[PDB]
């Protein structure tokens, strides 16, 4: 690339970005030093540490919400530039050491029980996760021929889904105005991008050319295709059978790899980060597993985030499905990403979501938790 190269005619702290106020993990990872070496390096598709880390120039964060501060272009750029994905993904992943190894599990069989979660309290069970298709750029950086191709390949495997997982594909670009409404009243449908971090790294690029909602006819198996990454999955069900939710999930994912395959196609992954994806802060299982639950009193306790905290557990937002209990429900899932199994953190979701209700009822009889508050897991 000649712009690069007359990137490079300017002395590096010349074109060295001013991270003075950021709070992000790019911004207490990149030296002035480290963009010397780097701002040289390039991907096999063009990506460069620019690239890299204009959204967490662009973005400088919160103190207390620290962003990762940077995106992958490609499965290269993870390795181009390591020396500086890897402290951040140590600083954002638990000390993530870059010599350490990621176990993927996905046999719903090695999760103990979580098929009765106490109806009453929890609502709704989902497991999310995405997939980067290996040999096309990330959703930053891919192209409208390629974006095209991945959604081509995608819709196949899809509509050769049945049973349970039979389903149906809509596109962005075709969709009516009833079928735009339906979706939204089902909760399946993103729209146009619009927040200064996506609209700046590229991901809204040829909006909505190559981008797709796929759900089954039972509203339990969703995916979305060129959004965020290649695809987005998502596995859900109203009540607390977790582990049906996670056998779904599972199974379809597992039809899914081996359409891919018989097609000569396959996911990003490899045994130190798992599974690739856009952002560094989804690498590995990219699992995101919660429940919407109602704990109103645990709430408005002193010691609700501590609890989370030692449950290895995140209160990602409140309201539930339709808002309206903001206060009272809560969604809780498993905090960490990459070093544990997927068994692993729905387990642990499991395990947590149990002592949580326990400790609401308590709350409800009007005594104290103090002797039910857990150690750090
Ligand atoms: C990790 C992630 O999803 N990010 C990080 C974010 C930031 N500014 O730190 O920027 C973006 C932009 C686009 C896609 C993903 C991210």
Redesign the pocket.
Known sequence: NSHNALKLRFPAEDEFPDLSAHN?H?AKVLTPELYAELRAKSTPSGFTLDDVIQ??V??P?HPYIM?????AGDEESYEVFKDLFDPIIEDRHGGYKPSDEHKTDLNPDNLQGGDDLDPNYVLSSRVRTGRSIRGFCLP?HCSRGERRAIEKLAVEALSSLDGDLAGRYYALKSMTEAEQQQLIDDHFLFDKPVSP??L??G?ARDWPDARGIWHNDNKTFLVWVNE?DHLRVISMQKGGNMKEVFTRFCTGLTQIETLFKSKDYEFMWNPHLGYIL?????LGTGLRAGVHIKLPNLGKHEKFSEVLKRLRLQKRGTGGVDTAAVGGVFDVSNADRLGFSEVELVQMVVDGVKLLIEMEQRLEQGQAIDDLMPAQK
Not at 67 to 71: E, K, L, S
Not at 278 to 282: F, R
């Open positions: 992000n790019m959204t967490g662009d973005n964060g962003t990762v501060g940077c995106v930053p971090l996506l700046a790294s991901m965020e856009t952002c560094p802060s989804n």
